């Protein structure tokens, strides 16, 4: 029974070390994915707002040519 317990201890040590590596790897994967999509969302909104300025700037130039 003492030999089975010695085995169980060394397996627990290996398993906890492996679980720590695993969670570090998952937590880091979800952080970097979350950051990428957040940053792309912020630049998309920046340029989609700058493109609304281009639509408005052509409405101003076409409104001029509707005073002819």
């Amino acid at each position: 029974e003492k030999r089975e317990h010695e085995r169980e201890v060394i397996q627990k040590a290996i398993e906890e070390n492996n679980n720590f590596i695993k969670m570090a790897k998952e937590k880091l994967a979800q952080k970097m994915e979350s950051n990428k999509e957040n940053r792309e969302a912020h630049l998309a909104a920046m340029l989609e707002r700058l493109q609304e300025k281009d639509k408005h700037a052509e409405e101003v130039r076409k409104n001029k040519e509707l005073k002819e």
């Binding site: 003492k2 030999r3 010695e6 201890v9 060394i10 627990k12 040590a13 906890e16």
Partner: protein, 428 residues
């Protein structure tokens, strides 16, 4: 031939073990190459107890040197008596154990232990009539405490009907400042209660105080400590190494010293106490040896013998002296101090005399007591242990090798039970 197989594990184990072999080799006239150069046939009658005999009339210690780092065993190999040991009996890893019982017992020590057992198996199979095993180690470190107790457990599985003997060095804050030693000691004591027949409690607290107070060494070294350990080790094995009447083997010693299986922890003593070099020119008289060997100041376990009662005692006198006078002085001690010897074990003090004294002395005496006062040593460890363990302090070094807190609770329990068991018989 009644062969004893010796194992030494970890720094302390290998250091006091190395010194043991130096001392007894000199007592048996064996030199560093293994050649006999003595002037007495008493030296060789029971040489096979500790030495194998090879061709060329060579004597090799039946000794296995174990450690998880190489430092201490390179020190032993390179030392003066280092060439005596069988080279394949040096079994060592590279990792070390980091003063961690879990590493020694469960992870780092597990990887090396089957190659130790292969050497133990080889030495055992070669024995005509094996008595059993003696291990030297500390309980405060990692390898000796953790791996050493792992070895005890494996040896017991292979050889369930042989005697297991230890010289276990107990940690003291006067010698070491590693915070986790009470953890390692309590875990190791849990093992010793279950799996040893006889344990000599060599307490570093006592060894330090003897060196400081009595021997007047203001800055003791490990060497100063070990000089008292080797004297004691020479002393308590005299009956096993020379002819031939009382406690002549390990089982007979155990049947005399161990009235209950769990209470097998002994409190050794020695007279005269000496430091290295500093010369004893005056031999002690039989009355002084007897007064001094029973003195608290001469015990290698830091326990007050007046605070308990002696269950059993072995006294072993060395040198040429009057057997009549030894008998008178021994009877005198137990008659003048009769209340410290339990009435319910009649005639519980046994006495041996060997004619050959140790190196540099004409007269010596060695005391081996199974006293209930030894609870004070375990109680000291328990208090140091509980202080940390009640806040689970430093426990991550152990749970990170896969241990659970429950192991600590069990070991804490078994040792506190040992203490209360000693108090039970102190009040009967």
């Amino acid at each position: 031939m009644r062969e004893i197989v010796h194992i030494q594990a970890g720094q302390c184990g290998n250091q006091i073990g190395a010194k043991f072999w130096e001392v007894i080799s000199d007592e048996h006239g064996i030199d560093p190459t293994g050649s006999y150069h003595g002037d007495s046939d008493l030296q060789l009658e029971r040489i096979n107890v500790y030495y194998n005999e090879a061709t060329g009339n060579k004597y090799v210690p039946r000794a296995i040197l174990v450690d998880l780092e190489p430092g201490t065993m390179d020190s032993v190999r390179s030392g003066p008596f280092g060439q005596i040991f069988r080279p394949d009996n040096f079994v060592f890893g590279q990792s070390g154990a980091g003063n961690n019982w879990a590493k020694g017992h469960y992870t780092e020590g597990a990887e090396l232990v089957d190659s130790v057992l292969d050497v133990v198996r080889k030495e055992s199979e070669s024995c005509d009539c094996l008595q059993g095993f003696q291990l030297t180690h500390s309980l405060g470190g990692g390898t000796g405490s953790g791996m050493g107790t792992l070895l005890i457990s494996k040896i017991r599985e292979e050889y369930p009907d042989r005697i297991m003997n230890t010289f276990s060095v107990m940690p003291s804050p006067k010698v070491s400042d590693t915070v986790v030693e009470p953890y390692n000691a309590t875990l190791s004591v849990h093992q010793l209660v279950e799996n040893t027949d006889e344990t000599y409690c060599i307490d570093n607290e006592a060894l330090y105080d003897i060196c400081f107070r009595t021997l007047k060494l203001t800055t003791p070294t490990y060497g100063d400590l070990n000089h008292l350990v080797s004297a004691t080790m020479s002393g308590v094995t005299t009956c096993l190494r020379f002819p031939g009447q009382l406690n002549a083997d390990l089982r007979k010693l155990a049947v005399n010293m161990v009235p209950f299986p769990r209470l097998h922890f002994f409190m050794p003593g020695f007279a005269p106490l000496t430091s290295r070099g500093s010369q004893q020119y005056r031999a002690l008289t039989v009355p002084e040896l007897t007064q001094q060997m029973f003195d608290s100041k001469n015990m290698m376990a830091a326990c007050d013998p007046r605070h308990g009662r002696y269950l059993t005692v072995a006294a072993i006198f060395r040198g040429r002296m009057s057997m009549k006078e030894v008998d008178e002085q021994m009877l005198n001690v137990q008659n003048k101090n009769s209340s410290y010897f339990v009435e319910w074990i009649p005639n519980n003090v046994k006495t041996a005399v060997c004619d050959i004294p140790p190196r540099g002395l004409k007269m010596s005496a060695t005391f081996i007591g199974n006293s209930t006062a030894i609870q004070e040593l375990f109680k000291r460890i328990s208090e140091q242990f509980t202080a940390m363990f009640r806040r689970k302090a430093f426990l991550h070094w152990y749970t990170g090798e896969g241990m659970d807190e429950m192991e600590f609770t069990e070991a804490e329990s078994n040792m506190n039970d040992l203490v209360s068991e000693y108090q039970q018989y102190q009040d009967a």
